[PDB]
Write a protein that binds this ligand. Structure first.
Ligand SMILES: Nc1ncnc2c1ncn2[C@@H]1O[C@H](COP(=O)(O)OP(=O)(O)O)[C@@H](O)[C@H]1O
Ligand SMILES: Nc1ncnc2c1ncn2[C@@H]1O[C@H](COP(=O)(O)OP(=O)(O)O)[C@@H](O)[C@H]1O
Ligand SMILES: Nc1ncnc2c1ncn2[C@@H]1O[C@H](COP(=O)(O)OP(=O)(O)O)[C@@H](O)[C@H]1O
Ligand SMILES: [Mg+2]
Ligand SMILES: [Mg+2]
Lengths: 371, 65, 187, 371
């Protein structure tokens, strides 16, 4: 039978079949409901919209994200999301496919317990498994040694792995990711008279950030240049035909990754988090961990981020060490690619959580056969 | 970089040439080009080459002419 | 139009005269694309002037009153009202809705009713909204020829759809709730 | 020399000398022009009437508000209003007196730039300073810790301050204020047949809203009482002698503050925004913030609004905390009193922006010496 891989990330949902090279369905993880009262009878209106359908009609809907900082808050919305993922995008019958899942490290255990219960009762999947996203990211890049910095939509975490052995005590987690950058841009855009307050307009700011932002190699040097001339200015066309122009907002919004204090967080920048995580491992494996930095996830697609990361780490690390930052062009889907690779390995087929096991053990079995 | 961060955000280089001569040598030691005395360049929103009056969702419920 | 036909010695003060002037307005008036340009042409020559026959045999001729009468739809300042024109009212009506549906609402201006039947009013509407609207957006005016009875046709459609027979109001419901039921059941 | 405080709000303009207890001059912020033709020669009719003289003769004028949602839109009209305030209402020469101006948080930066430029070029003031209205509200209360809810004619905003330390990331701004309530009352008054469409008739609706509206403790119980009897019906006499009677509209119009969906807005009511703004702060200062809610602004003067605020917040906060709402009787002039206090302090004399400092850095200086 064919295995299914479903990476239910905070922002987007990636789904497909095991053994494939790319996901088959990718749609936003939003559930939308009408906010205006209907007047025309005969067409019919659904009570809710899921995925791309909710994106198209976003002018009359309020879009609620079922997943916040990597933790499933709304469960009914996530049930509808999985219903969509199973019956309208992949067009499969869940009972006839073993499904794999992903989860951010250091999350509450109730989250994975409820995930296992929902999949074994509502959908009656024959077998399932929950993996750590960083581990799948490392599978996708064909390496067994290195430190993974997966930065998605809700969570940015570091997981050092050496020779197939992980060091749990060195794992870091930071709740600073793409959604916080979108919120910060929405706040900063008010400095130029542009006000976005509604949930539909949050999506527009997200597209602006995707298409016009970049990480500056030297922050103070870049700010001076944009204050001196108009070279860095670019214009974006709003959906209604109006045009907006953003100047130094282009590289200020992503700078929150390296200076979290902009949005009021006390944590250190992601470069410092990576350095702290490397330094907590054994002294004999730091040389290999310095030279195998692997980035993956959507938030690591800002142009120039690799160079800034290399510069910061080199500034932090000793001189004689060699720093190499690995940014494969398909890193946005590294987690799903790794999940597809893991489900297609022969040795992994003995590690599924069968329904029988779950029935005997109960939702608590997720804490034993999974890391 | 740390010195420039204080200058732009706090105003460490406000005097831009008539400092205490103790802060001068420390800055001169950090950056030897002696360009910090010019002052941190700032962006002025008065001119607005790209001024774009935009009526968004909220601004469209209340206007004049 | 009654107040403006006095400028040529024509006086109409009674209700039958009201109906007569309304008939003149229906049969002779039209909406000028450029009011300032059309006003020059009328004052320059006599091509715009037409003739109408009163019920008692007298003949009247009207000139710039042909397009000054319907201009009050665009400039309510003519009758002393502070409100804005219909084009600017339509423009404001769109800017009060959500940003993602403005594109569709520009492309579906539907107009109906007798006052909308003036020749050329669709083109003036299109030009004014295009002047107000962003340059990228497409302004399309939908003016079906039977728009004088669009409301009745829509009522006929809605009274014959199957999914409507459950949205009626019945005497049995009336007796229980009283006249207040109409606001609760209808929009 | 004596300092001036000028709180150019959206609805009313307050002015006076520093150290005084109350503003000397308060007049509506309206610039009006005739909309008829003057057939009598020898009167020498002027072009624009500003202030009270615009309200007295509003039967033949069109009234226009230059400030809206706290953002100045018509700079010539604002120039006229400031000229009137300096010369005809205060009878002072602006070139000899320091001046203090107030602004809402999160405004576009170009707004205060032009204010600085106008004061330093057109009026040639010796010195000026821009403060945030919410902070000045706390100065008048004699408190150094608490959350302020300022709600005037254009803008309703929250600013949390603990021990003189503001938390910018927890600032809330909501464009739902007195003008919106007046417009909604106009839209509802058509239910009883009364029609108001002109700008002169807007001011009458404002007066009836001021003199008859009240905030209901329990909305649903209040509606049933209004429909059951005629106890809440009151009468108002229009300026022409005609009399009108309004029913449940007395408490439906102010209910928009707590339910913005009435006027089509998506954001939450003021109570939920206040609760959310506190909850974005550190957990060790939430007790003080619950204990020191300060309200100010004209939209706060409705009878019984403080009790509704207390009932609404206590239902959201934990049972153990104490909610104390502070509504001083003169809170309609809190901002001006706070400004008068601030301009009178000796320790504030070094924070002025002088002309010699202005020219040196251009109008950009306002973004550094102010907040
Ligand atoms: N080209 C890009 N530039 C900047 N940000 C991007 C780009 N592409 C995607 N993103 C960001 O990546 C986030 C989602 O990426 P992803 O890692 O797939 O999220 P998740 O892991 O939750 O599925 C989005 O919030 C978006 O802001
Ligand atoms: N061909 C026409 N040209 C201009 N105006 C017209 C024409 N036909 C009708 N009207 C105007 O339309 C008005 C009412 O038409 P109608 O749409 O039936 O009104 P209602 O919608 O109230 O039934 C009449 O007063 C008349 O002045
Ligand atoms: N007694 C009152 N009851 C209800 N509303 C009031 C009262 N007094 C003033 N207002 C409202 O307050 C608004 C402006 O007051 P104010 O706070 O001075 O505005 P600003 O802060 O912009 O100067 C007006 O629009 C008016 O509707
Ligand atoms: Mg992910
Ligand atoms: Mg105010």
């Amino acid at each position: 039978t064919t295995a299914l891989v479903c990476d239910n990330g905070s922002g987007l949902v990636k789904a497909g079949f095991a053994g494939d090279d790319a996901p088959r369905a990718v749609f936003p993880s939003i559930v939308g409901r009408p906010r205006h009262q209907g007047v025309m009878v005969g067409m019919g209106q659904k009570d809710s919209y899921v995925g791309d359908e909710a994106q198209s009609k976003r002018g009359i809907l309020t879009l609620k994200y079922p997943i916040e900082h990597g933790i499933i808050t709304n469960w009914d919305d996530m049930e509808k999301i999985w219903h969509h993922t199973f019956y309208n995008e992949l067009r499969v019958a869940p009972e006839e496919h073993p499904t794999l899942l992903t989860e951010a490290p250091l999350n509450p255990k109730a989250n994975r317990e409820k995930m296992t219960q929902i999949m074994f009762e509502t959908f009656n999947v024959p077998a399932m498994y929950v993996a750590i996203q960083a581990v799948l990211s490392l599978y996708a890049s064909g390496r067994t040694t290195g430190i993974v910095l997966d930065s998605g939509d809700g969570v940015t975490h570091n997981v050092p792995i050496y020779e197939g052995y992980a060091l749990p005590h060195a794992i870091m987690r930071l709740d600073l990711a793409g959604r916080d950058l979108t919120d910060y841009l929405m706040k900063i855009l008010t400095e130029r008279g542009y006000s976005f307050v509604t949930t539909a307009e949050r999506e527009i700011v997200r597209d602006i950030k995707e298409k016009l932002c970049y990480v500056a190699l030297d922050f103070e040097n870049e700010m001076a240049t944009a204050a001196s001339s108009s070279s860095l200015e670019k214009s974006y066309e709003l959906p209604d035909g109006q045009v907006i122009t953003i100047g130094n907002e282009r590289f200020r919004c992503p700078e929150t990754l390296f200076q979290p204090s902009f949005i009021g967080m006390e944590s250190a920048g992601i470069h410092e988090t990576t350095y702290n995580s490397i330094m907590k491992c054994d002294i004999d494996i730091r040389k290999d961990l310095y030279a195998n930095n692997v980035m993956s996830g959507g938030t690591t697609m800002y142009p120039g981020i690799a160079d800034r990361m290399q510069k910061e780490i080199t500034a932090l690390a000793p001189s004689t060490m060699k720093i190499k930052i690995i940014a494969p062009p398909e890193r946005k889907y590294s987690v799903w690619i790794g999940g597809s690779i893991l489900a297609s390995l022969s040795t992994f087929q003995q590690m599924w959580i069968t329904k029988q096991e779950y029935d005997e053990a109960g939702p608590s079995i997720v804490h034993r056969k999974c890391f | 970089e740390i010195a420039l961060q204080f200058a732009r955000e706090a105003g460490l280089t406000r005097l831009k040439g008539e400092t205490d001569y103790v802060l001068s040598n420390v800055l001169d030691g950090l950056i030897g080009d002696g360009s910090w005395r010019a002052g941190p360049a700032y962006e002025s929103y008065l001119n607005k080459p790209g001024v774009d009056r935009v009526i968004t969702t909220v601004d469209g419920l209340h206007m004049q002419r």
